[PDB]
Design a protein around this motif. Sequence first.
Motif, mmCIF file in Angstrom:
data_model
loop_
_atom_site.group_PDB
_atom_site.id
_atom_site.type_symbol
_atom_site.label_atom_id
_atom_site.label_comp_id
_atom_site.label_asym_id
_atom_site.label_seq_id
_atom_site.Cartn_x
_atom_site.Cartn_y
_atom_site.Cartn_z
ATOM 1 N N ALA A 124 -1.401 -3.116 -6.314
ATOM 2 C CA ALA A 124 -2.798 -3.096 -5.970
ATOM 3 C C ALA A 124 -3.365 -4.513 -5.875
ATOM 4 O O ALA A 124 -4.202 -4.808 -5.006
ATOM 5 C CB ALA A 124 -3.547 -2.280 -6.972
ATOM 6 N N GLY A 177 2.290 -0.522 -10.300
ATOM 7 C CA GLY A 177 1.108 -0.074 -9.588
ATOM 8 C C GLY A 177 0.043 -1.130 -9.521
ATOM 9 O O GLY A 177 -0.459 -1.420 -8.440
ATOM 10 N N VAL A 178 -0.280 -1.709 -10.672
ATOM 11 C CA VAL A 178 -1.276 -2.772 -10.816
ATOM 12 C C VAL A 178 -0.884 -4.052 -10.055
ATOM 13 O O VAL A 178 -1.740 -4.712 -9.420
ATOM 14 C CB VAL A 178 -1.522 -3.037 -12.336
ATOM 15 C CG1 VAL A 178 -2.197 -4.375 -12.611
ATOM 16 C CG2 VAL A 178 -2.311 -1.911 -12.929
ATOM 17 N N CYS A 225 -2.398 -5.935 -2.564
ATOM 18 C CA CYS A 225 -3.318 -5.414 -1.565
ATOM 19 C C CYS A 225 -4.679 -6.098 -1.624
ATOM 20 O O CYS A 225 -5.160 -6.545 -0.597
ATOM 21 C CB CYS A 225 -3.468 -3.903 -1.660
ATOM 22 S SG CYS A 225 -1.969 -3.034 -1.285
ATOM 23 N N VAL A 255 1.549 6.631 -6.983
ATOM 24 C CA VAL A 255 0.483 7.540 -7.343
ATOM 25 C C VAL A 255 0.979 8.972 -7.248
ATOM 26 O O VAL A 255 0.789 9.756 -8.146
ATOM 27 C CB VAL A 255 -0.789 7.319 -6.524
ATOM 28 C CG1 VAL A 255 -1.727 8.510 -6.674
ATOM 29 C CG2 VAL A 255 -1.475 6.032 -6.976
ATOM 30 N N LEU A 271 2.498 1.674 -3.323
ATOM 31 C CA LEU A 271 1.425 2.119 -4.210
ATOM 32 C C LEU A 271 1.162 3.632 -4.072
ATOM 33 O O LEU A 271 1.159 4.355 -5.087
ATOM 34 C CB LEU A 271 0.145 1.299 -3.994
ATOM 35 C CG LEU A 271 -1.091 1.650 -4.846
ATOM 36 C CD1 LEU A 271 -0.838 1.625 -6.388
ATOM 37 C CD2 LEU A 271 -2.257 0.728 -4.466
ATOM 38 N N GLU A 272 1.004 4.123 -2.841
ATOM 39 C CA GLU A 272 0.851 5.576 -2.652
ATOM 40 C C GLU A 272 1.967 6.386 -3.232
ATOM 41 O O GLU A 272 1.699 7.454 -3.792
ATOM 42 C CB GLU A 272 0.657 5.942 -1.183
ATOM 43 C CG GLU A 272 -0.629 5.350 -0.649
ATOM 44 C CD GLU A 272 -0.708 5.315 0.849
ATOM 45 O OE1 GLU A 272 0.351 5.410 1.502
ATOM 46 O OE2 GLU A 272 -1.839 5.183 1.381
ATOM 47 N N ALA A 282 5.680 2.559 -14.048
ATOM 48 C CA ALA A 282 5.023 2.895 -12.792
ATOM 49 C C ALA A 282 3.596 2.352 -12.768
ATOM 50 O O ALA A 282 3.130 1.877 -11.735
ATOM 51 C CB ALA A 282 5.021 4.389 -12.595
ATOM 52 N N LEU A 339 0.829 -1.185 0.000
ATOM 53 C CA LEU A 339 0.000 0.000 0.000
ATOM 54 C C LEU A 339 0.885 1.265 0.000
ATOM 55 O O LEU A 339 0.660 2.191 -0.795
ATOM 56 C CB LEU A 339 -0.950 0.009 1.199
ATOM 57 C CG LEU A 339 -1.796 1.276 1.346
ATOM 58 C CD1 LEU A 339 -2.902 1.218 0.293
ATOM 59 C CD2 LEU A 339 -2.387 1.335 2.781
#
Lengths: 68, 77
Positions: free
Chosen positions: B46, B42-43, B49, B22, B18-19, B38, B15
């Motif tokens: 996520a 990212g995917v 998570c 973003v 991931l932040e 990125a 997480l």
Amino acid sequence: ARPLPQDFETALAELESLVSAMENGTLPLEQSLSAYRRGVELARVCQDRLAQAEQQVKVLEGDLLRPL
Amino acid sequence: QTDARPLPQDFETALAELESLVSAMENGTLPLEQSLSAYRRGVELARVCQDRLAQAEQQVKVLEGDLLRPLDPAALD
């Protein structure tokens, strides 16, 4: 009556512990009903926290993709 | 192209990473190739998570079921 934890990890840990006590066959009828009421409240806390977390990840996924 | 660093497998670190992606994406300073890198990281993040949440949710549902079992009288017809 005992305050009810509001964070996922403590609520989960009490729920696990309530379950074992329930299954060890030693709680009287009345304590079993208390344990049940208590565990419903705890599971509700766990699910609320997980829903929040799911939502937070979705929002991050949307934010990741938005610039693309 | 693809980000080759090991992928966190725990909710918190995934997480947190991931932040930060973003944040990097919504700064616009990213050339296309790095944005796409990125995005794929990212995917994957996520997905870790979402996998851990799904498991925790199932673990809670099992625990609920276990709580109710000893309160079940014997089945009638």
